[PDB]
Amino acid sequence: GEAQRRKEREELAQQYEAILRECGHGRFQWTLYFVLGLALMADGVEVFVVGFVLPSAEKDMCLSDSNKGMLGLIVYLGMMVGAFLWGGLADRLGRRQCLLISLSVNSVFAFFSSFVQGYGTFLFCRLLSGVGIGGSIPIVFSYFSEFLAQEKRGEHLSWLCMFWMIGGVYAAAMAWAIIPHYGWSFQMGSAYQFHSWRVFVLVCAFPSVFAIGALTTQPESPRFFLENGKHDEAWMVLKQVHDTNMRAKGHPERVFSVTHIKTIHQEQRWGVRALSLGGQVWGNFLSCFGPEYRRITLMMMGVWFTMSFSYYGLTVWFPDMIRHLQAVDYASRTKVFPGERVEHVTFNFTLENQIHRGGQYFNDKFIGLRLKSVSFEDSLFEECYFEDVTSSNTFFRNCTFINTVFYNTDLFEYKFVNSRLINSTFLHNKEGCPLDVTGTGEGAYMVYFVSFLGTLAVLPGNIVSALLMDKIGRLRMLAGSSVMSCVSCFFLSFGNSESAMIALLCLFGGVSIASWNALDVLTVELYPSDKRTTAFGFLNALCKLAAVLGISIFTSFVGITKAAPILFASAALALGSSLALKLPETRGQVLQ
């Protein structure tokens, strides 16, 4: 029984490869390449939106700690759910069908989140958008693989990763050209406010809609039709491929010589259908852990987990380290004024990064002052008057206030730490958040630039892989790029300034891309066409879970030491390369 099924599958794969060789490479392949490139660009854009809008949403929504981190991680949680779900569903519903469904869900919820005012609703909308876009990568790669002959499969598949970098560049450019315009205050509804980061979210949800629009005009992959017992539509799709290719070539007169293609033999209602779909998906997932695929699946799991953990940890750790260095410089530039006795006089100033200690102000009226990271310590205020005072990161510690009036000030109760107020009156307090939210100004600009640089770092290595995938092999490229990634992780210690961190981030991003391309091609080529998307989606869910763990750990390791992240990344990459070197070779084989 098993032998007959294996023979049928092998013969079907061989005939399919022969048909694809007969049709050739041409206009149809490039058109589908661009369509799925848009589908992948949507995914590439999706991972930057929350990170780019957090500085503004934290003030526009009164975001505290333990809520910004969840906002950051919700996209990866949504991707982890969506990758598995759509990878499981694509082997039973179709690659194009599930791609349309998931992309439409992503577009709908990304459009909805652009107008949502609350936090829990924003978290839910972003989680559902991540669920929608989670399954873009596995479905796109398995869908593009089934239209390529064995002569050039790694090259044509690795050309498909340029669009992830293009999406990253697009997100960086949109953030640079949209977010800095803080003056935009469109008003629709008195209780609601429309800022520029919502416009950024809209423009970032645009590429998923464009991808759906491009995907409406592409046919289903013939291989899914053949596996599922449908031979007429598979033959029609192959004929359409042949006609398009040969019409582009310049010979629109030859005839599709293929007549018959052997097909795999096939052997309350809503609830029954859902139960059947769940059972079949669970069966596919369990067969992925079968006697034939049990070593391969475990090694693939290890490689995906290790490389995702290391890459995501590093790519989140680099901006955090840059920010920590900038904060250290800022705190090193702080000025100190120990002791000052001040008599009756009106006070006007805008102070940045100062500490006044041991002050004694008597009958001083502070009118219209902006305070930025200004701290008063050991001070005594008597018969003072604060009017039109606005302050951020300002604290009054060990201070005593007597007969003082705070009129039209945002000096809330959390800014008076270990302070004693006697007979003091708070009048007409300005509207503000109950707790500190910090402030981000011009320093956001460079951040976008940094991200842009990182994405540009991917540009060279990709090309090399695209020019060398079929010359050396997937295993050799994977190992030889993981080794360089480990070398860069060790080299990490030779940098303590912002420029050094930028150069190191660019180097790591430019080195790991070849390994990622090889991993994608290898996981495409190592699984049969009836389990390709299920396995790819499961491995992508594992990748997203590893990304979450790595992000959490490497954020917890910022500002403590530079040895723990280096050790973790180097160990994980070494283990991943070791596990990868034992995989089987798939170059020069039919897509079986």
Place this chain on the structure above:
Amino acid sequence: TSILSIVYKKDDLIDLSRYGAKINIGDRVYYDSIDKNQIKLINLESSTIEVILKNAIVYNSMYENFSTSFWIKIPKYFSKINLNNEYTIINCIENNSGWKVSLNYGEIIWTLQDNKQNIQRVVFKYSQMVNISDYINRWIFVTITNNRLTKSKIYINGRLIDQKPISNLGNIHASNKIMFKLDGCRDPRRYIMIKYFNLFDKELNEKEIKDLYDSQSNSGILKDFWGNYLQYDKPYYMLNLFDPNKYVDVNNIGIRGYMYLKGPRGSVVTTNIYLNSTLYEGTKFIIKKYASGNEDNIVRNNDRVYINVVVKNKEYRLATNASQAGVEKILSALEIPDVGNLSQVVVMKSKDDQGIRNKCKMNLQDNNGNDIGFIGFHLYDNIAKLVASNWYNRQVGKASRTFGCSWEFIPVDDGWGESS
């Protein structure tokens, strides 16, 4: 049934009961100008009151039940000197045996002690961190009952607060003379107000305590936030009981303008001494007599008055157009001579139809004696606008819960000590 009852008279304090208690008063004891029956005691040796009963009415038994009642006003405690400073205000202990009532930071304590030096203490506690307090600087009706067989109980405003068994206590002796002075107060600027001190030789139950509370409450006269009499030509700040976190404010002057509820209120803080809400915010309301024939300035029930409103230290008049859309019609503050024929007359109500005392309410009526309705607030497009409506009267007729027809008048007082 009353043995001692101090009541003001012509420049003296007289016992109403048929016992002729001898009362002597110090030279630094004050009397309020409007309500001379209220007695003010300061933290001075001279500010003293002695009362002397007869030898036939001295509490000297073991099975004798007895009760005391009075009205007390205690200002706010401002600084840290006041905690852990229990000071006696009324005393009747001699040879270490008797009864006394004292005050501590947010506490009113009643103490009994017998010949065996056994202490029984019944305490009422009120916080000082509340936004709006019911006891800080406001008149409080305190009644203490003692049944030697069962319990000693305290009652604040006619409701039970604390009770403690005293059956273990032995024979309680009482002084021939009763004290009224502040003893043991370290604060040298601390004073109290007491009035209507009554003594009974039996334990009162809930019914007698309650009807005594109504009898001594003077339900026929309006009261301000502090419990004093409501007076004409005196600026009052406005507080709404239903919405106590917003103050009455105006934006424009005239018919095109409206008065609304603007918030939130400020705060007055002294770092774990008090965290009160600011009471001197908004626009002051002055009451002008129109048809009240009484010579005094006291505002009584069913008085038909005018309501001036103080905006930027200028006096305007409350008025509204009787003929506009809807029953809930907006109120406005407009110039005094230009009012013309818009409705001005407001009837002050203190007690309900049955005579049960409630808070201050204002019923706007026109020149023809037709009730425009009670004054309250209604929400128009997220603005709490002051309106005169018949809806509150309809709810009162149906015995339903009215929403926002109850107001409080807060004059500036020294016991609050807020900076304006």
